Design a protein around this ligand. Structure first.
Ligand SMILES: Cn1c(=O)c2[nH]c(SCCN3CCOCC3)nc2n(C)c1=O
Length: 500
């Protein structure tokens, strides 16, 4: 019967109700703001700041395709002029789009296959859909792409490793950048940054990529029919000092656990976990189509983090506030399908950001299952999750619940019961409640609930629980000679505590 256990999801903190009154939006040394704050108003397209395009071409900023320093061999010609000449042509067949994109990517004319784009256009779309694509949608995408210098007038700093820095930009500015990415215009991007140009979406024989392209075109149709009016903030967070887990005397926090529902639909206004790759967005611009890549497709503004976010080190995360949902879907991986357009009904905060906060935290990939019970590996996951959850200088009553699930399970080989306890401990340390979605696994729901209430009723601290994890390693894992231990973790914990 029972679809959820624990604290009712209704009793969990959410944005905007729980939120602090935001300080005045303004640029600072650690906050790049690319719009006119004095003109930011509800329901109005933000005005770029500055008024005129300013260029930086260096190792600390995005290399813009419209830079006068973006050159091609002829003597040197302007590659931005070449990109205009190429893209300002009628498309009537997918070959025409391939040929356009290759005019300014000539070194890749042999290497970039467009099979998936061709299949999408010719073999997946209805003839009327394809018509609307080349008559309306692609020309509008070209125009927003070519408007980049008037839209993205302010250099965009890279969120490099170890930087604690935020970029607040307009949804409109993202749209212009993403249209550039579609047309593969970002220079020098073809090794510690994710791919941004969309060339791999077009290549190879694929059933996933046509569905990816349906999802992205749904977005591009929307933001070219009418400019979106809000802002999005991208924050890299890198922590210097981590808890002494074994000494942590904080209590556990509340838990809601359910096998029905999704982070994105049922965790509205909560801190939504992206089960991330350390290259944020994972295989979104290529073949990947599981939880991170789906989120990045239905909220495509997340993709632009790939333009400027260096690969995450162990102590870092990326926090994205304000992305809008444009699509709905069913399935995942081989069964993923674009369903329909989604009208996002989220309220906006006082910076006109959708009240949607997503954190990219990358779990480790465990080729050997027992490796993840090694203390250094448990601490690594605790500290990553803690970095993703913690908000320095916010009171606990202003913190939404964490909406998450089986982080690093699936391809990464994580143990769901261990990872649930790790996230429960990290959340407790960050003074946040947990909303946990087991994604149809009703046994796992009961198991996590049963363990959580056992530890709470016995008033064990974060430290008490961590020590029991160390016991489990030392007694059942360390000198274990088979692929799996003799005794499972939760049974071990119950016996260890009930024995006291
Ligand atoms: C809680 N949760 C998920 O676990 C999830 N997984 C997927 S894709 C398939 C892979 N997963 C299967 C469950 O283990 C995580 C790996 N999409 C998801 N969404 C939207 C979600 O809300």
């Amino acid at each position: 019967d029972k679809k959820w256990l624990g604290t009712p999801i209704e009793e969990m903190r959410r944005m905007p109700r729980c939120g602090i009154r935001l300080p005045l939006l303004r640029p600072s040394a650690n906050h790049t703001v690319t719009i006119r704050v004095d003109l930011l108003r509800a329901g109005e397209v933000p005005k770029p700041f500055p008024t005129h395009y300013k260029d930086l071409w260096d190792n600390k900023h995005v290399k813009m395709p419209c830079s006068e320093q973006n050159l091609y061999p002829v003597t040197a010609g302007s590659r931005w002029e070449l990109i205009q000449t190429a893209l300002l042509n009628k498309f009537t067949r997918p070959q025409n789009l391939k040929d356009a994109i290759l005019k300014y990517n000539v070194a890749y004319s042999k290497k970039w296959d467009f099979t998936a784009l061709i299949d999408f256009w010719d073999k997946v779309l209805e003839e009327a859909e394809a018509q609307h694509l080349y008559q309306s949608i692609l020309p509008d995408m070209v125009k927003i792409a070519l408007c980049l210098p008037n839209i993205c007038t302010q250099p965009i700093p890279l969120l490099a490793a170890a930087m604690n820095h935020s970029i607040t930009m307009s949804q409109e500015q993202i749209a212009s950048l993403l249209a550039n990415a579609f047309f593969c215009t970002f220079p020098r991007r073809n090794s510690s940054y994710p791919d941004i140009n969309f060339n791999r979406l077009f290549e190879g024989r694929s059933s996933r990529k046509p569905e990816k392209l349906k999802t992205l075109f749904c977005y591009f149709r929307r933001v070219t029919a009418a400019a979106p009016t809000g802002l999005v903030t991208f924050t890299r967070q890198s922590l210097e000092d981590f808890p002494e887990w074994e000494r942590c005397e904080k209590p556990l926090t509340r838990l809601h656990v359910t096998y029905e529902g999704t982070i994105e639909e049922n965790g509205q206004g909560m801190l939504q976990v992206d089960f991330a790759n350390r290259f944020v967005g994972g295989g979104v611009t290529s073949a990947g189509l599981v939880q991170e890549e789906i989120r990045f497709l239905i909220n495509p503004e997340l993709i632009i983090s790939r333009l400027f976010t260096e690969v995450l080190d162990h102590n870092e995360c990326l926090i994205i506030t304000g992305t809008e949902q444009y699509s709905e879907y069913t399935g995942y991986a081989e069964t993923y399908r674009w369903s329909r357009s989604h009208e996002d009904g989220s309220e906006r905060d006082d910076w006109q950001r959708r009240c949607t906060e997503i954190v990219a935290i990358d779990a480790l990939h465990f080729r050997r299952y027992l490796d993840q019970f090694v203390p250094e590996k448990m601490r690594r996951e605790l500290n990553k999750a803690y970095c993703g959850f913690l908000r320095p200088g916010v009171s606990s009553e202003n913190l939404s619940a964490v909406a998450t699930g089986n982080w690093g399970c699936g391809a990464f080989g994580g143990d769901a019961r261990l990872k649930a306890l790790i996230q429960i401990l990290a959340a407790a340390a960050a003074e946040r409640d947990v909303v946990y979605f087991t994604f149809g696994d009703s046994e796992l729901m009961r198991d996590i609930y049963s363990m959580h209430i056992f530890l709470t009723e016995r008033k064990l601290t974060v430290g008490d629980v961590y020590k029991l994890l160390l016991r489990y390693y030392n007694e059942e894992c360390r000198n274990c000679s088979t692929p799996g231990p003799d005794i499972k973790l939760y049974p071990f914990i119950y016996h260890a505590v009930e024995s006291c």
